[PDB]
Design a protein around this nucleic acid. Sequence first.
RNA 1: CGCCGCAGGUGCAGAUCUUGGUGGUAGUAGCAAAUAUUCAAACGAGAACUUUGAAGGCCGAAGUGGAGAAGGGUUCCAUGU
Lengths: 50, 60, 107, 63, 61, 354, 153
Amino acid sequence: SSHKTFRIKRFLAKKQKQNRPIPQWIRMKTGNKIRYNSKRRHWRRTKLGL
Amino acid sequence: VFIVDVKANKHQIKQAVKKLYDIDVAKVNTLIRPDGEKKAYVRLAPDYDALDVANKIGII
Amino acid sequence: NEVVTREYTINIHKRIHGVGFKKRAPRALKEIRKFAMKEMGTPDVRIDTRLNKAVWAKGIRNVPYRIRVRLSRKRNEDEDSPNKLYTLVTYVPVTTFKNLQTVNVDE
Amino acid sequence: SMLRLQKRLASSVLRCGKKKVWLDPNETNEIANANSRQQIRKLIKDGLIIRKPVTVHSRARCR
Amino acid sequence: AKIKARDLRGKKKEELLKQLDDLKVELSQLRVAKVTGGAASKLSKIRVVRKSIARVLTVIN
Amino acid sequence: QQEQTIAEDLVVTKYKMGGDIANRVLRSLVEASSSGVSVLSLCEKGDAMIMEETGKIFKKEKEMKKGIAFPTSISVNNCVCHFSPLKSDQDYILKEGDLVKIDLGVHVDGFIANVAHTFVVDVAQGTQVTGRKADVIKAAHLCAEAALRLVKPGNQNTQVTEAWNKVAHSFNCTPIEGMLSHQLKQHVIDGEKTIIQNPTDQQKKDHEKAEFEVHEVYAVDVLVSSGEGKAKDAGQRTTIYKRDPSKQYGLKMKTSRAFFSEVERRFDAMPFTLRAFEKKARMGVVECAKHELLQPFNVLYEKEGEFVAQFKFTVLLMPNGPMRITSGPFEPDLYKSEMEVQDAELKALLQSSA
Amino acid sequence: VRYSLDPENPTKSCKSRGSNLRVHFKNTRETAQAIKGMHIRKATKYLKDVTLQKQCVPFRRYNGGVGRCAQAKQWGWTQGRWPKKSAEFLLHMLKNAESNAELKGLDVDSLVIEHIQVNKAPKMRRRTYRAHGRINPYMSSPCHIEMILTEKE
RNA sequence: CGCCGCAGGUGCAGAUCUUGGUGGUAGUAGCAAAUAUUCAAACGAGAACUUUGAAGGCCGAAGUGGAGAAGGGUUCCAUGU
Ligand SMILES: [K+]
Ligand SMILES: [Mg+2]
Ligand SMILES: [Mg+2]
Ligand SMILES: [Mg+2]
Ligand SMILES: [Mg+2]
Ligand SMILES: [Mg+2]
Ligand SMILES: [Mg+2]
Ligand SMILES: [Mg+2]
Ligand SMILES: [Mg+2]
Ligand SMILES: [Mg+2]
Ligand SMILES: [Mg+2]
Ligand SMILES: [Mg+2]
Ligand SMILES: [Mg+2]
């Protein structure tokens, strides 16, 4: 909602920063074995815990 | 416009800008961004210009 | 010639008879387009917006029985198109349809 | 090309609905260049954007 | 031109605090340059100044 | 269809005027620079003469825009080019024995005469300049003679690059990677026809192949370092911008809008410097260049202690032999090298004057 | 790459190929069988006529529920349709094959489709929602298509 | 891997067996609740569906309008794909 506590807003802030694509240079690293961010979350498919 | 520490209040922002930029400020407006960082709108005193201060700060 | 323009009257009533209420006006413009392709032999038929108003003047189901149109076959020599000829059909307002023939109209 | 933004801004500037905003169908390119409310105001002054009049609902029959 | 821990230990509190202040104003300038594009040379100096600040502070402590 | 080429004698005469005026400004500058001077003063002076002389010339026509086609640019022992500091920036004081690179351009009726020359300051009478730097300037001037001789319809743009690489390797140096010369036409300084200097795979695959044509101007540029040929930036302000007339964006700030209008009024499409304004210019330029309204010309730095040279001059291409309109004061008596040309074809092209 | 049925001599032959194409395999297989053995000019008109519904492709194997048409009598059949998307995809591949033929410098007025093959491509998954809180597959059926054109006249 | 001994979590068609994969069904059922679309133009490789204009309709202020609480958490806004 519009009325939110600081903890809830701070919690939403962290979930927002970590929902980004992996940097491209990562695949160039030796022994990368990572293709894409498997922890991507869309607001409509899956809802946050809180 | 500055990005400040989330624990700093308006009084602390006012003193911080005053000493390390040698300017006088009129008021400080504060919000916390959706990314979690705190943003401060620091309005300078009328006798100070925000354009040359930004020029010597280096954010032109 | 091939840049000929002619003026016709189309029996919309005949060509719309039997069509449902919500489809009479949309079908009237399809029959008008079909009519133009037949007499002018051009697949590309452009219908003037004023003619589109006249067909839709009395709503979607009470289409006018008769409409007086003017078929202008013109060159498409303006861009690379599969058709070098196109027909522009326009609206000709009339007060009566009695004794109205198909007439060749000059420039 | 696409003028969804311009019709929204013209509606806000003219203080009318998007029903009454008229964008010149011939001068689409100039309107497409307007990305600011100031640019929309200049286009309104220049006649490329017009507030259409209210649809007539007469009371003569009732009177 | 870097600062080491060994040569910091002979200094007294006044210039150690002076040394720390000069590094802090330089790091803040580097952070300004990071936001306004800056250069790769200035971006790579952010870590160098940060560890220099840590180096001065640990000697004071 | 309405473009103006060299088919007209008036075009010919005002090209000659641009060449003469650029030559006289550079001749004044090479003498005026001495030990203990300031590059800010040099840049201000170089613009100051050009303004008055272009104003007094064509006094009977006050409808055409004429003046600076490229701002005065100084590069001294550590900078490549596009260097022109403002008053607020820390100035550079000329020491003894520095080699400096001068770039300056003039325009008449939108047509460009743009010249760059490297020379050493404060040369004593009877002395010889000796060192590793003594070969790079001489190789650049040999590139100048090579380009002058070989610029001709039918000679490909991929031949001048290999000739310059060949002479650079003959002098055991290399040019800076990825520098572009251009074909210069009316109100254009960044023409589609591009010549490339010391390319690599990416620039070669992005480069075009073309055949030299009649009735056109080239700005052939040699720009050679004595180290590795690589350059970057050292966190210094960019001072040269040019308005791109292709793309447009609606500027939402009054300062940027006024700055852009002033740029259109004075330096409509030609490169300028932020010195020509300052307080509000430095703020307007960031919003203008964010949306690619102004192409920047960044300062490029070589490694510390390296030496880099440059020559460049507008050459017209006429059917019976190209001519040079802007020339720099380089003398072989006061400047020699410890190594010469070991290529027979290079000797053949350098010994043949145009 | 490995084609099935290499040409009798790969000097008067050109090849074209596509993988994971978003056309129904069943419609494309029937359309490929119709143009097999055709001259390249005949196949191009025929595929254009299918788009205009002036000529049909007979549905011989994957014919369940396929309706009857008058144009199916040109073929010795009764059931036919006008797969527009299959016609476009084969038209694009025929253009690619003809361009390959020009690259090898063999004339394109004598090309004949001697080999054409439609293969199943890996299915792609979507979802559909059913009556009592049930999820059902909504699979796509893409196809790999290859063809070989040879000169004969 | 053969031979002499030794030791087993040692042999599958089934168990409405477990996990995975694939068919016929089948180009089938179906994409039918709430009246409705049409003409011209633009961009574009490509237009029934995008945008603009014109026309015909609908919601009809107990709205298919304008704003909030709870809940969602960036879905908001530009540009691009
Ligand atoms: K049928
Ligand atoms: Mg939900
Ligand atoms: Mg607050
Ligand atoms: Mg069946
Ligand atoms: Mg369902
Ligand atoms: Mg359910
Ligand atoms: Mg067992
Ligand atoms: Mg089994
Ligand atoms: Mg069905
Ligand atoms: Mg149905
Ligand atoms: Mg109603
Ligand atoms: Mg509402
Ligand atoms: Mg949105």
